[PDB]
Amino acid sequence: RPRTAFSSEQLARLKREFNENRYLTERRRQQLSSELGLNEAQIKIWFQNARAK
Numbered sequence: 001r002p003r004t005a006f007s008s009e010q011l012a013r014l015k016r017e018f019n020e021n022r023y024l025t026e027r028r029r030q031q032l033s034s035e036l037g038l039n040e041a042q043i044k045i046w047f048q049n050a051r052a053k
Contacts, residue, residue, distance in 0.1 A: 001041050003049070010036050014043075018050050 006014065013036060021028075024047050033040045 001045065003045055004038070004042050006038070006046070010038060014046055014050075018047065022047070022051055 013032070017028075017032065024032075024044065029040050029043050032038070032043045036043070
């Protein structure tokens, strides 16, 4: 799955979340998806990519 483009707001949330905990659980992935309007797949990819970088 190719990565979508994230808005500034979505990125703001993801960065703060990543800085609290770099690893996702199911419930946290679901909360992010529902609060960000992003597919869970996109959330997982962003976290993986962020750890990679």
